Amino acid sequence: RHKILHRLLQ
Amino acid sequence: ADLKSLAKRIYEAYLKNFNMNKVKARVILSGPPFVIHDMETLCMAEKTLVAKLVANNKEAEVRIFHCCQCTSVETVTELTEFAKAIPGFANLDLNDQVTLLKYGVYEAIFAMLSSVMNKDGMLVAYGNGFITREFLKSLRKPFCDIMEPKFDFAMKFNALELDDSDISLFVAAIICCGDRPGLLNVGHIEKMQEGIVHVLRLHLQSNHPDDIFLFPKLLQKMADLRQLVTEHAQLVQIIKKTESDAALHPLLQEIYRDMY
Numbered sequence: 001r002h003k004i005l006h007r008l009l010q
Numbered sequence: 011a012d013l014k015s016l017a018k019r020i021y022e023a024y025l026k027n028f029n030m031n032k033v034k035a036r037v038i039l040s041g042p043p044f045v046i047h048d049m050e051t052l053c054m055a056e057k058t059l060v061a062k063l064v065a066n067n068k069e070a071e072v073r074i075f076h077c078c079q080c081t082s083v084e085t086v087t088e089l090t091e092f093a094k095a096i097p098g099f100a101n102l103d104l105n106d107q108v109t110l111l112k113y114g115v116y117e118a119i120f121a122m123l124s125s126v127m128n129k130d131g132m133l134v135a136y137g138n139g140f141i142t143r144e145f146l147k148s149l150r151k152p153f154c155d156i157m158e159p160k161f162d163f164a165m166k167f168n169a170l171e172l173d174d175s176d177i178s179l180f181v182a183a184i185i186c187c188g189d190r191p192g193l194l195n196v197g198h199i200e201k202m203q204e205g206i207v208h209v210l211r212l213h214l215q216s217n218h219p220d221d222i223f224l225f226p227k228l229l230q231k232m233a234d235l236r237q238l239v240t241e242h243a244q245l246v247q248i249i250k251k252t253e254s255d256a257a258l259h260p261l262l263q264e265i266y267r268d269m270y
């Protein structure tokens with residue numbers, strides 16, 4: 001549900 | 011544990027990850043930034059600083075709001091890197107990392123925005139523009155309502171005379187907040203928060219011996235920021251629903267969605 005934030009966190 | 015070292019590590023991460031800090035901003039604000047005080051100078055600044063946006067065009071207020079969102083997107087990215095450098099953050103469940111950032115980024119954004127604001131305006135576009143507070147007030151509704159509460163917060167926040175070493179810890183405390191909705195490991199986050207807040211408390215004692223209430227003042231500012239963000243999100247929803255041309259960037263849509 002937070003694909004971008006989740007990506008930035010990787 | 012070495013609290014002085016944790017504070018220095020958080021400060022170093024702040025200096026590394028944010029393009030703007032209070033020292034940089036003050037150098038610029040002291041006197042180069044192109045001054046935006048009316049529609050003529052807005053249009054001139056756009057042609058120099060965001061040429062692609064006016065090479066076609068939307069209403070001036072909608073173009074300004076687009077530049078607002080672009081700034082927020084960039085600051086969210088900086089905050090995510092900063093958070094990943096906060097000692098202990100990376101050990102959290104990835105879902106909790108997302109939750110902490112979702113609820114914390116706009117509180118942190120408006121706290122840090124104070125560093126580029128004075129009573130007359132604010133730095134924009136990576137320090138290359140200065141847009142006046144009166145010009146933003148002059149925009150048509152609802153866009154003239156975006157920035158004024160943020161200036162009001164910043165004037166009182168700036169009167170605290172914090173420096174970047176303080177603000178870095180304050181932003182870390184904003185992010186490391188155990189009462190955000192939907193957290194999975196509340197206990198661990200609360201202990202992480204307790205640790206960061208302890209470092210903040212000791213740092214303020216050392217750095218501001220003149221102001222014995224600075225720590226409780228800053229706790230109150232954290233609560234003020236949560237209210238500011240709740241109200242900001244409400245205005246953004248009004249804009250999203252009534253302003254077809256004011257497209258919301260997808261990262262900001264995912265942050266706002268199901269927030270308050």
Ligand SMILES: CC/C=C\C/C=C\C/C=C\C/C=C\C/C=C\CCCC(=O)O
Nearest residue numbers: 055056059074077078079081082134135
């Ligand atoms: C040359 C023109 C470029 C920039 C000047 C135009 C607009 C101001 C730019 C940035 C303002 C700074 C921060 C935005 C603060 C609040 C609105 C945030 C919008 C949001 O993400 O919900």
